[PDB]
């Protein structure tokens, strides 16, 4: 009828119905259960000692009795550790990738580059590099513009100490799935006993009047602008022009040339008020040769040009 996994921190058990749900072609619920057990064993060294070696080696994902025996063995090992303990940190990057996968599989049940379906395999590591590079503190406010199902926001919230993390998505289908992703993330994080910063996944148009002041007051913007049209790009540069000095924008395509040279003919260009650098994990990376672009609000670019003319 069903499979149960006791939480290492005494939260409510994870309940899986049998037959287990079928995920996408290269993910399955049975291996999710097994990997969940292996991750909890890493978190708790005593759990490995309490558990008999054969349990995680010899199993049959296609047998209810076999899958039930595995869950029973883990649950009894958890109970022994809970007895031993009688007598809340940020998740590790490896655990976080697994949590995000689990959160996705439990949220998206119904049927092109960097698809949410393959986030863990093609996006996670690049996002993890960007988090390591773009140093964020408790004074920062993070916003992912066009956040989709909310994976980037969840990864950043589980990794940094920003005051708040926001995801804004306009499309009906991703924004609705993000509601489930949000609930599933909070639930699974509690189950493992892991800490995450505050975040909000919301439906809205980042080009709206409400969002103008919100963009102006954001210190760190992430924006996958790869598929943006020239009008969306033009309107976004106008929003960025209201940001504070030192405000940062991390994007998949640059908003200004990397080599911008201020002159009399290009004074209205966004390049007059922002520094732009191309960052790459390749500069021990072994994934895709993909770059990200860091823009920093700096009005001294414009100031020095005027001072140069007057002096
Ligand atoms: C990828 N999907 C989502 C979903 C929701 N939210 C965001 N946010 C977000 C914001 C800023 C950037 C900068 C980079 C490099 N990535 C990026 C990261 C991982 C993989 C690819 C990336 O970018 C692309 C995308 C397409 C083509 C080429 C590169 C960004 C992602 N991304």
Swiss-Prot record:
GO terms for molecular function: DNA binding; histone H3 methyltransferase activity; histone H3K79 methyltransferase activity; histone H3K79 trimethyltransferase activity; histone methyltransferase activity; nucleic acid binding; RNA polymerase II-specific DNA-binding transcription factor binding; transcription coactivator activity. S-adenosyl-L-methionine binds at residues 119-122, 142-151, 169, 205-206. The modification Phosphoserine is found at residue 280. Residues 12-310 form the DOT1 domain. Keywords: Chromatin regulator, Disease variant, DNA-binding, Methyltransferase, Nucleus, Phosphoprotein, Repeat, S-adenosyl-L-methionine, Transferase. One of its GO terms (cellular component) is nucleus. Signal peptide: none annotated. The keyword Methyltransferase applies. Changing residue 224 to A/D: Loss of activity. Changing residue 41 to G: Found in a patient with developmental delay and intellectual disability; uncertain significance. The keyword Cell membrane does not apply. It is found in: Nucleus. One of its GO terms (biological process) is DNA damage checkpoint signaling. It is linked to Defects in DOTL1 are associated with an autosomal dominant form of global developmental delay and intellectual disability, with or without one or more major congenital anomalies. The patient phenotypes are characterized by central nervous system (CNS) dysfunction, such as mild motor delay and significant speech and language delay, and a range of congenital anomalies, including brain structural anomalies, cardiac defects, varied urogenital features and growth restriction. Variants may cause a gain-of-function effect leading to an increase in cellular H3K79 methylation levels. Interacts with MLLT10. Histone methyltransferase. Methylates 'Lys-79' of histone H3. Nucleosomes are preferred as substrate compared to free histones. Binds to DNA. In contrast to other lysine histone methyltransferases, it does not contain a SET domain, suggesting the existence of another mechanism for methylation of lysine residues of histones. Belongs to the class I-like SAM-binding methyltransferase superfamily. DOT1 family. This is Histone-lysine N-methyltransferase, H3 lysine-79 specific.
